[PDB]
């Protein structure tokens, strides 16, 4: 009886095995655009992905992760609200069963079809496992997806999903450029929060981009053909793998833009 996104093991249950679920800095949150304050002192965000080295794509039973070589400063995130250098380790998505749901963060209570999380860790802590134990250990860049025109840079991802249908399957995924997943603007909101799945550690500086990317209906349909189950088990489609918005508590969301 492990955690997931079903009636019996979903977000409302997680607090029993992970009491930090009811903590002071949980994610995601609703972004109230009229309460978020422009902070003129936020530095300009630096996304340096030209030397990124993708390795593999994995169905972990919750989402699929595109994993990178993070054993050197290749693909890094700096600037914005960040102090120091954060290395890209993986990206994944959260998505819905229908186009009106699937994001984790919300904007004035609007839910997007999906949300992309590019996960980075602070190199001052030496490895990712040490970093998740620190309040400033991780930086996750969140990008909303809406359904409309195709995103060309997503197609290579879409096309390998058939090979990783079930939990525990992986495939070689070299030479993928995550720059192709960004929107034109790097305008963002930032706040201190958490992992959005167990173990729900309060270790993340969230950076959520204002501008969504557009994907096609056909692209998100292929996400929804993935399985939460393992091979040879009854089929449970991998849909609605998102945590709803959590209380903001004693936090301020800052805007990089006027
Ligand atoms: C394995 O999943 P993951 O992607 O990490 C590669 C996930 N990571 C993950 C990444 C991103 C996101 S999201 N959706 O972008 O927020 C969610 C989960 C995550 C899972 C588990 C942990 C650790 N869990 C953990 C629990 C408590 C503590 S403690 N003593 O309280 O400090 C320490 C470690 P670990 O497996 O060691 C890394 O140790 C049991 C760590 C990470
Ligand atoms: Zn995530």
Curated annotation (Swiss-Prot):
Xref: InterPro entries: CA_dom, CA_dom_sf, Carbonic_anhydrase_a-class, Carbonic_anhydrase_a-class_CS
Every Alpha-carbonic anhydrase domain range: 1-257
Species the sequence originates in: Homo sapiens (Human)
The name this protein goes by in its record: Carbonic anhydrase 2
Record-level GO BP terms: angiotensin-activated signaling pathway; carbon dioxide transport; morphogenesis of an epithelium; neuron cellular homeostasis; positive regulation of cellular pH reduction; positive regulation of dipeptide transmembrane transport; positive regulation of synaptic transmission, GABAergic; regulation of chloride transport
UniProt binding sites for Zn(2+): 92, 94, 117
Active site: 62 (proton donor/acceptor)
Site feature: Involved in the binding of some activators, including histamine and L-histidine: 90
A GO cellular component annotation in the UniProt record: extracellular exosome
Impact upon substituting residue 60 to V: Reduced activity
Phenotype for residue 117 to E: Strongly reduced activity
PANTHER family registered for this protein in UniProt: CARBONIC ANHYDRASE, CARBONIC ANHYDRASE 2
Effect of residue 195 to F: Normal activity
Pathological condition linked to this protein in its record: Osteopetrosis, autosomal recessive 3: A rare genetic disease characterized by abnormally dense bone, due to defective resorption of immature bone. Osteopetrosis occurs in two forms: a severe autosomal recessive form occurring in utero, infancy, or childhood, and a benign autosomal dominant form occurring in adolescence or adulthood. Recessive osteopetrosis commonly manifests in early infancy with macrocephaly, feeding difficulties, evolving blindness and deafness, bone marrow failure, severe anemia, and hepatosplenomegaly.
CC cofactor: Zn(2+); Co(2+)
Disulfide bonds: none
Subcellular localization, as worded in the UniProt entry: Cytoplasm; Cell membrane
Residues that, per the record, bind substrate: 196-197
Family listed: Belongs to the alpha-carbonic anhydrase family.
Phenotype upon changing residue 62 to A: Reduced CO(2) hydrase activity, rescued by 4-methylimidazole (4-MI). Reduced proton transfer. Enhanced proton transfer. Enhanced proton transfer capacity
Regulation of activity: Activated by X-ray, histamine, L-adrenaline, L- and D-phenylalanine, L- and D-histidine, L-His-OMe and beta-Ala-His (carnosine).
pH sensitivity of activity: Optimum pH is 6-8.
Keywords annotated in UniProt: Acetylation, Cell membrane, Cytoplasm, Disease variant, Lyase, Membrane, Metal-binding, Osteopetrosis, Phosphoprotein, Zinc
Cofactor: binding details: Zinc. Can also use cobalt(II) with lower efficiency, but not copper(II), nickel(II) and manganese(II).
Effect of residue 90 to P: In OPTB3; in Czechoslovakia
């Amino acid at each position: 009886h492990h955690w997931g996104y079903g009636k019996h093991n979903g977000p409302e249950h997680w607090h029993k095995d992970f009491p930090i679920a009811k903590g002071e800095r949980q994610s995601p949150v609703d972004i109230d655009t009229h309460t978020a304050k422009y902070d003129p002192s936020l530095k300009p965000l630096s996304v340096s992905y030209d030397q990124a080295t993708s390795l593999r794509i994995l169905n972990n039973g919750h989402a699929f992760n595109v994993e990178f070589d993070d054993s050197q400063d290749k693909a890094v995130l700096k600037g914005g609200p960040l102090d120091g250098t954060y290395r890209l380790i993986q990206f994944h998505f959260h998505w819905g069963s229908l186009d009106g749901q699937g994001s984790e963060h919300t904007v004035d209570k609007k839910k997007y079809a999906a949300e992309l999380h590019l996960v980075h860790w602070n190199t001052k802590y030496g490895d990712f496992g040490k970093a998740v134990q620190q309040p400033d250990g991780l930086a996750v860049l969140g990008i909303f997806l809406k359904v409309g025109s195709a995103k060309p840079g997503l197609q290579k991802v879409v096309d390998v999903l058939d090979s990783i249908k079930t939990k525990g399957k992986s495939a070689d995924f070299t030479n993928f450029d995550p720059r192709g997943l960004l929107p034109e603007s790097l305008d963002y909101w930032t706040y201190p929060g958490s992992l959005t799945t167990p173990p729900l550690l309060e270790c993340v500086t969230w950076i959520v981009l204002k501008e969504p990317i557009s994907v096609s209906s056909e692209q998100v349909l292929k996400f929804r053909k993935l399985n939460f189950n393992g091979e040879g088990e009854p089929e449970e489609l991998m849909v609605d793998n998102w945590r709803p918005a959590q209380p903001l508590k004693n936090r301020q969301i800052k805007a990089s833009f006027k």
